[PDB]
């Protein structure tokens, strides 16, 4: 683009070489275009794709049932399942577990990771 903006500012007259900065006002033609076809109309474009996809997606709106958040809520009837944590039994194996599972350890290890990056 700028290699052509400055061939067309030096542009002089039909079948004649260039003149340094003969007309800077020509830049307006290259600005308006850039604003219209490159910025405005190719963002109208993604906006149109977005709104069209949203319309394609709201076909299954299903207003007989209530809003979508309760839909996710009812879909999350599959929660409240157990999670393994291995609560320690040995006394020699519990102190270490507690100290490594405290935030006092994780803050320090974040600090050490940052120091190693440094």
């Amino acid at each position: 683009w700028p290699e052509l903006l400055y061939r067309s500012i030096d542009s002089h007259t039909e079948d004649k070489g260039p003149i340094y900065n003969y007309r800077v006002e020509i830049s307006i033609f290259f600005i308006i275009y850039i604003i219209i076809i490159a910025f405005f109309m190719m963002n109208i474009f993604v906006g149109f794709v977005i709104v069209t996809f949203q319309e394609q997606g709201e076909q299954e709106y299903k207003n007989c049932e209530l809003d979508k958040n309760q839909r996710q809520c009812v879909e999350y009837a599959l929660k409240a399942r157990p999670l393994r944590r291995y609560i320690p039994k040995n006394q020699h194996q519990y102190k270490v577990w507690y100290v490594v599972n405290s935030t006092y350890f994780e803050y320090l290890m974040f600090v050490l990771i940052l120091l190693n990056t440094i």
Binding site: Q72, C73, V74, A77, L83
Partner: protein, 219 residues
């Protein structure tokens, strides 16, 4: 969530891969024999001589990196390759214009397809109950309960780690008394309706919408 959205549309990206393959092979067969020399853009770094090289050139064009100079360098009149016993085609316009119009389209098609698949998350008030609050409840429930071993197990109101968002006027007691506790909290904290008959309404709604143990869900 974006990684999940990307991994849930393995075919929108397959289309881009197919486009890159098609144009790489076409550029191979048409522009493959141009002469490698610098001061041009078909050089020892950019060329349609091997498939990896052509795909790199097309990735360069897709990111819009002086693709017009490649286009002007593949126009006819260029000296042909020495390993070929002139070369250069005027197709180089339609090959490089259309590609840029195609990729830049299929990219957007991809991006939006990943945005809107995910649009449940991107627009979200973060105030009404969502998966974050439910998972935080799951972890605190595990904190007060080992693996799948909570039936009643409750004699305390120390469940105040539930923040102000889901004891104000002992509505906590009302919610608690009136996995099963999870679904009860889901229905009650939303406070969708208040009619004194919403337990049977929940029964019928769960029956119609649903698949699992509903013998404990309403109570």
């Amino acid at each position: 969530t974006f990684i999940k959205s990307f991994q849930a549309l393995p075919y929108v990206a397959l289309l881009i891969v197919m486009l890159f393959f098609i144009y790489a092979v076409i550029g191979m067969q048409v522009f493959g024999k141009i002469a490698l020399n610098d001061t041009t853009e078909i050089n020892r770094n950019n060329n349609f001589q091997t498939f990896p090289q052509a795909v790199l050139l097309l990735f360069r064009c897709a990111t819009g990196e002086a693709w017009q100079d490649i286009m002007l360098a593949c126009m006819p009149g260029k000296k042909c390759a020495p390993e070929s016993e002139p070369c250069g085609s005027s197709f180089a316009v339609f090959y490089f214009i259309s590609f840029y119009m195609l990729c830049a389209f299929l990219i957007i098609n991809l991006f939006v397809a990943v945005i809107m698949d995910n649009f449940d998350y991107l627009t979200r008030d973060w105030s009404i109950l969502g998966p974050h609050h439910l998972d935080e409840f799951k972890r605190i429930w595990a904190e007060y309960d080992p693996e799948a071993k909570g039936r009643i197990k409750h004699l305390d109101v120390v469940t105040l780690l539930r923040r102000i968002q889901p004891c104000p006027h002992r509505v906590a007691c009302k919610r608690l008394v009136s996995n099963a506790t999870l679904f009860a909290l889901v229905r009650t904290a939303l406070r969708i309706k208040t009619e004194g008959n919403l337990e049977q309404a929940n029964e019928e709604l769960r029956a119609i919408i649903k698949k699992l143990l509903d013998q404990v869900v309403p109570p």
